[PDB]
Design an enzyme around this catalytic site. Structure first.
Site, short mmCIF file in Angstrom:
data_model
loop_
_atom_site.label_atom_id
_atom_site.label_comp_id
_atom_site.label_asym_id
_atom_site.label_seq_id
_atom_site.Cartn_x
_atom_site.Cartn_y
_atom_site.Cartn_z
N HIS A 10 5.60 -1.18 -1.93
CA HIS A 10 5.31 -1.04 -3.34
C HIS A 10 4.10 -0.18 -3.58
O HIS A 10 3.80 0.17 -4.73
CB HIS A 10 5.12 -2.41 -3.99
CG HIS A 10 6.28 -3.34 -3.78
ND1 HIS A 10 7.56 -3.03 -4.16
CD2 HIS A 10 6.34 -4.58 -3.24
CE1 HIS A 10 8.37 -4.03 -3.85
NE2 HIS A 10 7.65 -4.98 -3.29
N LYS A 37 16.71 -0.70 0.17
CA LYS A 37 16.25 -1.65 -0.81
C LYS A 37 16.87 -1.13 -2.09
O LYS A 37 16.67 0.03 -2.46
CB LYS A 37 14.73 -1.65 -0.88
CG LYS A 37 14.13 -2.91 -1.47
CD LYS A 37 12.63 -2.81 -1.50
CE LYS A 37 11.94 -4.15 -1.70
NZ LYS A 37 12.24 -4.77 -3.02
N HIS A 111 3.99 -9.32 -2.95
CA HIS A 111 5.26 -9.19 -3.58
C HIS A 111 5.12 -8.31 -4.78
O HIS A 111 4.14 -8.36 -5.51
CB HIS A 111 5.76 -10.55 -4.00
CG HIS A 111 7.06 -10.52 -4.73
ND1 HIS A 111 8.25 -10.22 -4.12
CD2 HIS A 111 7.36 -10.78 -6.02
CE1 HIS A 111 9.23 -10.28 -5.00
NE2 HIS A 111 8.72 -10.63 -6.16
#
Length: 119
Positions: A10, A37, A111
């Site tokens: 990310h 992903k 996350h």
């Protein structure tokens, strides 16, 4: 190492381009391509700003376990194009500037709530 996984998944500090290819590349670059992903958002800008999402400095607690950055973060949501979970992982890059829901564990992004970048 989820932080690392987070960064890896990310975080793309200074993404060049943030187009499909960028996604496809960064997605590949990030090992996010096996399987592709389906959607993988790379927050850009300073790592720290993202890191900070983990503090109620640049972070609001969010949903359960999640933190939604207060700052908005140039974030390129590689949406896997094609149903195929598998390379080639063609990605619609969705350069999105919008705080980022993350799940900070131990003040570490661990996350990225991808949900917020599904559309």
């Amino acid at each position: 190492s989820r932080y690392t996984h987070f960064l890896t998944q990310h975080y793309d500090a200074k993404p060049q381009g943030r187009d499909d290819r960028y996604c496809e590349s960064i997605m590949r670059r990030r090992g996010l391509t096996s399987p592709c992903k389906d959607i993988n958002t790379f927050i850009h800008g300073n790592k720290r700003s993202i890191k900070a999402i983990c503090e109620n400095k640049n972070g609001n607690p969010h949903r359960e376990n999640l933190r939604i950055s207060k700052s908005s973060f140039q974030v390129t949501t590689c949406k896997l194009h094609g149903g195929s979970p598998w390379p080639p992982c063609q990605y619609r890059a969705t350069a999105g500037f919008r705080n980022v829901v993350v799940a900070c564990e131990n003040g570490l992004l661990v996350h990225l709530d991808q949900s917020i970048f599904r559309r």
